[PDB]
Amino acid sequence: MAATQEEIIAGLAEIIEEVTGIEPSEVTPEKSFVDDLDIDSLSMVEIAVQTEDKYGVKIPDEDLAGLRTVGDVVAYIQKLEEE
Amino acid sequence: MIGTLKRAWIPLLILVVVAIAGFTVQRIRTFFGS
Amino acid sequence: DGHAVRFIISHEGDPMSQAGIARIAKIKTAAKEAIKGTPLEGSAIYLGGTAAMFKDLSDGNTYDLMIAGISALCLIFIIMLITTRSVVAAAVIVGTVVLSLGASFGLSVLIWQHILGIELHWLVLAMAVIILLAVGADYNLLLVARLKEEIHAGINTGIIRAMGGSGSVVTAAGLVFAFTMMSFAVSELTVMAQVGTTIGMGLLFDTLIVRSFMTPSIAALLGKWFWWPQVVRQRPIPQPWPSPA
Amino acid sequence: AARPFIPRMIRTFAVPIILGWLVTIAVLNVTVP
Amino acid sequence: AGNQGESLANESVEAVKTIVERLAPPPGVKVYVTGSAALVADQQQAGDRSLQVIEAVTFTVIIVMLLLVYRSIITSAIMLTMVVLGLLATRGGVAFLGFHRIIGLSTFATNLLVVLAIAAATDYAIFLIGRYQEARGLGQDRESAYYTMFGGTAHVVLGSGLTIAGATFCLSFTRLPYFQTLGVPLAIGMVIVVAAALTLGPAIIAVTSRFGKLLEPKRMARVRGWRKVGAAIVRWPGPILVGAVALALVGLLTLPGYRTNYNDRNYLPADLPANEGYAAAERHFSQARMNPEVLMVESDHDMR
Numbered sequence: 288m289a290a291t292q293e294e295i296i297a298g299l300a301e302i303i304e305e306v307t308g309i310e311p312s313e314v315t316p317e318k319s320f321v322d323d324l325d326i327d328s329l330s331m332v333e334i335a336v337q338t339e340d341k342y343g344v345k346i347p348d349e350d351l352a353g354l355r356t357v358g359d360v361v362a363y364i365q366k367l368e369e370e
Numbered sequence: 371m372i373g374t375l376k377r378a379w380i381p382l383l384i385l386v387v388v389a390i391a392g393f394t395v396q397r398i399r400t401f402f403g404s
Numbered sequence: 405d406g407h408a409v410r411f412i413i414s415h416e417g418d419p420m421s422q423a424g425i426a427r428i429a430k431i432k433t434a435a436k437e438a439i440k441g442t443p444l445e446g447s448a449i450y451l452g453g454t455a456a457m458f459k460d461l462s463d464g465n466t467y468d469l470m471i472a473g474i475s476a477l478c479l480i481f482i483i484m485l486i487t488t489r490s491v492v493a494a495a496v497i498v499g500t501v502v503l504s505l506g507a508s509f510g511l512s513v514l515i516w517q518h519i520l521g522i523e524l525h526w527l528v529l530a531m532a533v534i535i536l537l538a539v540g541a542d543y544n545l546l547l548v549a550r551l552k553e554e555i556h557a558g559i560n561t562g563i564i565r566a567m568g569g570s571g572s573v574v575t576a577a578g579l580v581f582a583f584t585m586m587s588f589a590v591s592e593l594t595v596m597a598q599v600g601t602t603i604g605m606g607l608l609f610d611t612l613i614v615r616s617f618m619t620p621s622i623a624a625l626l627g628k629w630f631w632w633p634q635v636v637r638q639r640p641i642p643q644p645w646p647s648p649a
Numbered sequence: 650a651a652r653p654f655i656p657r658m659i660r661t662f663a664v665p666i667i668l669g670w671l672v673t674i675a676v677l678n679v680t681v682p
Numbered sequence: 683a684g685n686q687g688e689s690l691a692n693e694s695v696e697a698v699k700t701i702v703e704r705l706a707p708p709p710g711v712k713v714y715v716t717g718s719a720a721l722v723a724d725q726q727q728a729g730d731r732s733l734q735v736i737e738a739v740t741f742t743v744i745i746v747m748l749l750l751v752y753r754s755i756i757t758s759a760i761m762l763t764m765v766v767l768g769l770l771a772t773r774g775g776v777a778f779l780g781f782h783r784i785i786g787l788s789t790f791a792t793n794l795l796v797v798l799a800i801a802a803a804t805d806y807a808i809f810l811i812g813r814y815q816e817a818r819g820l821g822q823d824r825e826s827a828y829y830t831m832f833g834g835t836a837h838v839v840l841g842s843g844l845t846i847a848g849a850t851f852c853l854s855f856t857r858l859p860y861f862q863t864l865g866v867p868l869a870i871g872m873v874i875v876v877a878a879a880l881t882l883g884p885a886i887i888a889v890t891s892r893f894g895k896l897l898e899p900k901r902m903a904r905v906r907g908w909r910k911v912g913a914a915i916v917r918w919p920g921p922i923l924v925g926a927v928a929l930a931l932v933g934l935l936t937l938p939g940y941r942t943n944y945n946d947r948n949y950l951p952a953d954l955p956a957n958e959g960y961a962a963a964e965r966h967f968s969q970a971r972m973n974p975e976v977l978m979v980e981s982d983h984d985m986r
């Protein structure tokens with residue numbers, strides 16, 4: 288299970304595009320949902336639900352609060368997939 | 371046969387529902403006046 | 405020819421209350437027991453009037469409500485079963501329809517009787533359940549048809565997409581019609597205001613609570629059992645992360 | 650071709666449909682109280 | 683001469699009232715025409731004089747609600763023409779079938795049929811335009827969006843309308859003529875509303891869409907907010923169901939206190955003439971003197 292960071296970001300950017308509309312060219316690992324991308328706490332729940340449906344990556348509710356930047360989500364998914 | 375009555379389970383359920391409803395309705399139609 | 409005598413009876417309070425109508429059977433019974441054991445025994449006793457008319461109308465109203473309710477609920481179950489090839493979705497929708505009807509009429513009873521003091525006319529219930537069933541069918545069918553056509557991508561994502569797509573349209577339609585009906589509150593005829601605001605408050609409650617939170621959350625709790633005779637997956641086979649761009 | 654028959658016909662014959670509904674409403678509301 | 687509920691009865695009440703107020707009483711005396719037959723007359727004659735104010739206020743409200751839903755005057759105008767044409771076709775068809783004595787009408791079936799026709803017409807128009815504009819906001823061109831609108835909503839409109847028609851035709855099996863006379867006119871009205879909504883609706887959308895940017899979406903962030911609601915529903919469904927059921931319990935717990943009333947003079951303006959006759963009588967005898975019962979005992983032998 289070795290999805291590279293670019294693959295995980297490519298998969299996340301489609302869901303962020305559908306949920307919000309931010310262009311996938313704007314989803315980069317150093318931008319934080321709260322300020323830079325302006326994705327509130329309830330669109331993150333939707334991104335997590337759709338990621339779990341599509342790629343089977345289950346992100347529980349308490350960990351979803353600490354994922355501030357896109358790099359945080361990519362690192363979480365990688366640390367989970369390296370299982 | 372069970373194999374063929376489960377391709378036509380929707381029309382059968384519709385028949386049983388419509389029959390129970392129609393009997394109940396024709397029964398209740400008689401209460402008034404009497 | 406002297407074969408029939410008639411008596412002209414007046415009430416004390418309101419003839420057309422709930423008591424003035426329960427007095428009709430008592431009048432007939434009193435007149436029947438008066439001729440018991442007398443040479444007039446076995447005579448025919450006819451009681452006409454206006455509280456007698458409303459006794460008979462109030463009796464027939466219950467059974468006609470039951471006939472209409474049985475008929476409408478069976479038709480609604482049948483269309484929800486034909487559209488969504490599932491017994492659980494049809495039964496859930498019929499149950500939420502009955503629950504929303506009950507809650508709507510209870511809210512209007514509260515507002516009108518217990519707060520404004522004016523009791524509800526006797527035809528308000530009938531004319532309200534007619535329209536409320538008619539429009540609840542519309543909105544529930546539109547929501548669940550979309551849900552069914554979109555659960556192919558996962559039941560949760562299907563519900564998210566179906567909400568985002570059809571829940572907004574359902575609430576727009578419901579609010580337009582509900583605020584159209586609540587404009588009857590300007591009528592001098594209190595029965596028109598009653599039926600209008602009953603339909604309006606019912607539709608507000610439906611579109612804003614029942615069809616917006618209670619129906620999709622039941623569809624989300626019962627994950628794949630919402631479509632039971634059909635075998636659906638909670639979510640598809642997990643895809644591998646795509647190649648960039 | 651790959652479009653269903655009902656919506657395709659409603660889309661191609663859209664303006665005769667509107668004219669026919671207008672004529673129907675006119676007749677139904679003028680011939681009858 | 684009439685029969686309570688019909689039109690001959692109102693003819694008779696107005697005839698009697700004409701006779702009575704034709705001549706002058708002695709000074710101090712005032713005459714009235716009370717009773718549950720003159721009350722029904724005044725009721726049915728003020729019903730229409732309120733109905734013609736309602737027909738204006740409901741449209742003044744429909745217009746502003748359409749402007750709030752579609753933040754655009756052209757879209758509200760188009761969809762209002764859809765609704766108005768559906769309502770006109772329904773009223774015309776039912777007045778035609780009732781005029782030529784084909785079906786049995788009423789002055790109550792009509793007041794309910796207008797309401798139901800407006801409800802169904804606005805619902806179907808909003809459904810169609812909402813699906814068209816949603817498919818249009820996803821990037822589809824006018825052709826693909828029209829076809830998506832149809833393929834998504836036509837069967838829903840057909841099914842729901844046909845069940846409303848069947849359910850309101852099943853009223854023909856009740857006993858009270860109030861309800862029993864609602865059967866065929868309401869069913870026919872629903873069939874006409876559905877035929878209109880399925881042929882005239884898409885036709886209007888397919889004609890007006892090919893000009894400029896007539897039916898193009900404006901407010902699509904509503905879809906985003908509703909997606910967030912759906913996300914909250916799929917993530918925490920148990921709590922939300924508990925909340926919704928708790929709210930429904932408030933209403934369901936009031937029902938076993940429901941009392942009804944049959945006095946029509948409580949739900950009418952006290953300015954009606956029949957009600958002022960009631961008041962004049964209540965000033966002198968009691969509330970129940972104008973509504974008397976009659977009990978007849980018919981034996982088989984001369985009782986004199």
Ligand SMILES: CCCCCCCCCCCCCCCCCC(=O)OC[C@H](COP(=O)([O-])OCC(O)COP(=O)([O-])OC[C@@H](COC(=O)CCCCCCCCCCCCCCCCC)OC(=O)CCCCCCCCCCCCCCCCC)OC(=O)CCCCCCCCCCCCCCCCC
Binds near residue numbers: 575617747750915
């Ligand atoms: C006779 C005189 C005439 C009188 C009559 C005539 C009057 C004429 C004028 C009429 C004026 C009224 C106009 C009606 C609205 C018209 C607009 C329209 O048609 O649709 C457009 C409108 C979109 O407007 P927009 O500004 O363009 O949207 C862009 C946003 O800004 C962009 O999004 P955002 O960032 O701002 O926010 C995101 C999102 C919001 O996203 C979220 O974050 C929400 C999700 C949060 C997490 C989930 C938690 C849910 C918890 C559930 C618990 C159980 C359910 C309880 C729900 C309540 C709490 C939400 O917002 C949304 O856009 C979607 C909202 C969806 C949620 C709303 C659901 C309603 C909840 C129920 C409230 C009322 C209770 C019903 C009881 C009534 C029965 C008596 O669509 C809606 O949002 C519908 C919801 C709002 C309208 C309904 C609210 C009430 C309306 C009147 C009801 C009166 C109730 C009185 C009760 C008093 C107590 C007894």
Ligand SMILES: CCCCCCCCCCCCCCCCCC(=O)O[C@@H](COC(=O)CCCCCCCCCCCCCCC)COP(=O)(O)OCCN
Binds near residue numbers: 387
């Ligand atoms: C207001 C009126 C309400 C009245 C009706 C209330 C609800 C009554 C529910 C009765 C359920 C009877 C329906 C049985 C469905 C059987 C499913 C079946 O035969 O086929 C499925 C087979 O799947 C199964 O394995 C189901 C086998 C279990 C069936 C046992 C019946 C259970 C009865 C439940 C009792 C509930 C009764 C409640 C009464 C109040 C799959 O077939 P398909 O996918 O090819 O068809 C879909 C395309 N048309």
Ligand SMILES: CCCCCCCCCCCCCCCCCC(=O)O[C@@H](COC(=O)CCCCCCCCCCCCCCC)COP(=O)(O)OCCN
Binds near residue numbers: 841844847877
């Ligand atoms: C007094 C009369 C009433 C008595 C009858 C009482 C009961 C009425 C029940 C009526 C049931 C009608 C069934 C219609 C809903 C069908 C549900 C369904 O299975 O949907 C399928 C729909 O499949 C279809 O394709 C059906 C298409 C129907 C087109 C609608 C016809 C429009 C006709 C226009 C003129 C209407 C004139 C009507 C006059 C009354 C799903 O297919 P899909 O997911 O692939 O999406 C559809 C994409 N095309």
Ligand SMILES: CCCCCCCCCCCCCCCCCC(=O)O[C@@H](COC(=O)CCCCCCCCCCCCCCC)COP(=O)(O)OCCN
Binds near residue numbers: 925926929932
């Ligand atoms: C028998 C009647 C029962 C009524 C039941 C109604 C239940 C409906 C639930 C309404 C939910 C309203 C939206 C909830 C949004 C949740 C957002 C959230 O969770 O976070 C915010 C939560 O904010 C809220 O909105 C909480 C919800 C308040 C509404 C609760 C009232 C509904 C329950 C009524 C109880 C019954 C009333 C008694 C009968 C009148 C932030 O709160 P905070 O941590 O910043 O506050 C800390 C300050 N000390």
